[PDB]
Amino acid sequence: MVLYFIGLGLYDERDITVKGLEIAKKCDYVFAEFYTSLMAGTTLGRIQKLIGKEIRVLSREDVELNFENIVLPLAKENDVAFLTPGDPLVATTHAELRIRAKRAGVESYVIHAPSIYSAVGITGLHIYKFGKSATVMYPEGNWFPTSYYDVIKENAERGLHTLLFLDIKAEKRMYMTANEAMELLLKVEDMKKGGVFTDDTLVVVLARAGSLNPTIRAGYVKDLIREDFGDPPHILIVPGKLHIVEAEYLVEIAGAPREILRVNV
Amino acid sequence: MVLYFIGLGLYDERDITVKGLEIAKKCDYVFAEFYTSLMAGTTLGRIQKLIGKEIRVLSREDVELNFENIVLPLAKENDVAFLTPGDPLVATTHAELRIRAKRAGVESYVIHAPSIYSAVGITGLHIYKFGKSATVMYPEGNWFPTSYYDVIKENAERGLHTLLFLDIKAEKRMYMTANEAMELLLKVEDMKKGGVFTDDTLVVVLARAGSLNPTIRAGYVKDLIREDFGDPPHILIVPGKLHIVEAEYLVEIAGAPREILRVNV
Numbered sequence: 001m002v003l004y005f006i007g008l009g010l011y012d013e014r015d016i017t018v019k020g021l022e023i024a025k026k027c028d029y030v031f032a033e034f035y036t037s038l039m040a041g042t043t044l045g046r047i048q049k050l051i052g053k054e055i056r057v058l059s060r061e062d063v064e065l066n067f068e069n070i071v072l073p074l075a076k077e078n079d080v081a082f083l084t085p086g087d088p089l090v091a092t093t094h095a096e097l098r099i100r101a102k103r104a105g106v107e108s109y110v111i112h113a114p115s116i117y118s119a120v121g122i123t124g125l126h127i128y129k130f131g132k133s134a135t136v137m138y139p140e141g142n143w144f145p146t147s148y149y150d151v152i153k154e155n156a157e158r159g160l161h162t163l164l165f166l167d168i169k170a171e172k173r174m175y176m177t178a179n180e181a182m183e184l185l186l187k188v189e190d191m192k193k194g195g196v197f198t199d200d201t202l203v204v205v206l207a208r209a210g211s212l213n214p215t216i217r218a219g220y221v222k223d224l225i226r227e228d229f230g231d232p233p234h235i236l237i238v239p240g241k242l243h244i245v246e247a248e249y250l251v252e253i254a255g256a257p258r259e260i261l262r263v264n265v
Numbered sequence: 266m267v268l269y270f271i272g273l274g275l276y277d278e279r280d281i282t283v284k285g286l287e288i289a290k291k292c293d294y295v296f297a298e299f300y301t302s303l304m305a306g307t308t309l310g311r312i313q314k315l316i317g318k319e320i321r322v323l324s325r326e327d328v329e330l331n332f333e334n335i336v337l338p339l340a341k342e343n344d345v346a347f348l349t350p351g352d353p354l355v356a357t358t359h360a361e362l363r364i365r366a367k368r369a370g371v372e373s374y375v376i377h378a379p380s381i382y383s384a385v386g387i388t389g390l391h392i393y394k395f396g397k398s399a400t401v402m403y404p405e406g407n408w409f410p411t412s413y414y415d416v417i418k419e420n421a422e423r424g425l426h427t428l429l430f431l432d433i434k435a436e437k438r439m440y441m442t443a444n445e446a447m448e449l450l451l452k453v454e455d456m457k458k459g460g461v462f463t464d465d466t467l468v469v470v471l472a473r474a475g476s477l478n479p480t481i482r483a484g485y486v487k488d489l490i491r492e493d494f495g496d497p498p499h500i501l502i503v504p505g506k507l508h509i510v511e512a513e514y515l516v517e518i519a520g521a522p523r524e525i526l527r528v529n530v
């Protein structure tokens with residue numbers, strides 16, 4: 001008896017690691033959640049087909065409130081897996097579920113899978129130069145979140161890049177676009193006026209990482225804010241000071257304006 | 266006419282994704298490099314047997330000096346794969362290779378795989394709280410580099426965690442251990458007196474991420490500096506102030522002392 005947290009990867013069902021597939025195939029019960037991220041290139045059926053097991057999908061409430069009532073009981077008598085998009089423990093609160101497993105006497109194992117957190121490397125930006133990350137959250141009611149704006153400011157002060165995860169309302173099938181996140185940011189800048197995010201800010205958009213042809217675009221907010229980046233999911237990145245080879249790659253691979261080649265050192 | 270950058274993942278031959286494996290099997294020629302890092306849980310023979318293709322290994326000079334003369338020519342009239350440990354393009358210099366492909370008129374696609382950059386999610390530390398990353402380098406001769414110490418200081422200053430890659434002599438298969446990294450940083454502390462890394466600093470050690478049995482340990486330097494964390498590779502993390510949920514994961518899963526619950530939160 002054991003519980004496995006198995007990541008499914010960035011885009012489709014083949015983004016699972018071979019390790020994860022052969023372990024998932026021999027589990028007695030398989031559960032999964034698809035609310036922490038969007039795998040735009042597959043379906044439940046295709047995943048079930050690949051793993052050869054029926055998958056029961058859990059909602060945020062089933063997990064956050066009933067994980068120990070729905071999943072853990074089986075794991076005491078059987079080999080159980082819990083599948084998630086990307087890497088199970090990245091920008092989720094799933095790590096705490098391991099604590100629940102322990103206090104229920106269930107041993108758990110983690111099988112990693114490609115994550116958007118490291119897949120940003122395809123933007124050409126040096127991974128080590130990424131600072132603190134943040135999430136753009138949809139304003140709801142009279143509440144307008146803005147903390148992600150300060151993260152950008154503090155990273156950019158240090159010359160660090162900022163990775164911006166975008167909001168998701170899976171049960172409403174709403175996936176925030178980079179365009180939406182740019183609009184939100186311009187609005188917070190008119191409030192705070194820190195010169196952090198303007199029409200002239202260089203940004204990078206990565207859409208559907210993991211697919212064979214993801215959309216990778218770099219340019220000024222004024223030029224990109226109304227551009228079509230294709231289907232979700234999307235992440236937005238606000239680079240800090242660029243190394244020359246970073247700029248080179250943004251121009252050659254992501255279609256950035258030639259002039260960012262001229263780095264002001 | 267196509268070059269595929271395929272990641273092999275964290276630890277053994279099963280850490281490659283299903284997508285990467287299937288694509289590698291259909292490639293006419295398969296290259297790989299093991300200088301940016303090593304796949305400590307497997308061998309080149311086991312990877313070859315899994316892919317069912319002979320793998321020509323390239324040195325760092327083969328790649329950096331002659332990538333366009335060794336790999337790209339074949340990719341003009343064949344499907345070629347270039348394998349690398351972890352996630353492709355996380356290593357600083359690899360992105361550039363895609364520009365070389367473009368220049369040579371060769372199509373390139375990136376197949377992602379788990380990277381230690383994202384796998385540290387398994388320490389229970391929130392991914393978004395990681396700041397700039399650094400590598401602890403072995404000093405030698407009259408050269409004692411210490412920038413990695415500076416990186417810790419300005420992340421922790423901002424309440425951020427610091428991911429520290431450890432030095433490696435890929436070709437001699439010599440891995441720097443977390444213990445050596447800790448002693449070094451105490452050495453740098455004695456040099457710089459910044460109050461950044463001392464006996465009382467809380468650290469996290471992650472060894473053999475990707476394995477089903479990785480070592481995850483958290484505690485104060487005075488206690489962990491001579492502890493055996495098992496076979497390489499080792500990764501060292503100097504956490505910033507912890508969220509209570511991070512601290513209880515470290516206590517419950519990483520064997521951290523209860524003391525962190527009131528000293529580091």
Ligand SMILES: Nc1ncnc2c1ncn2[C@@H]1O[C@H](CSCC[C@H](N)C(=O)O)[C@@H](O)[C@H]1O
Nearest residue numbers: 010037086087090115116166208209233234
């Ligand atoms: N393939 C992909 N392409 C672009 N953005 C992606 C993505 N997968 C995830 N994201 C981003 O991350 C958000 C979910 S955050 C959860 C991330 C997941 N554990 C992982 O390891 O990737 C999405 O709303 C989106 O902004």
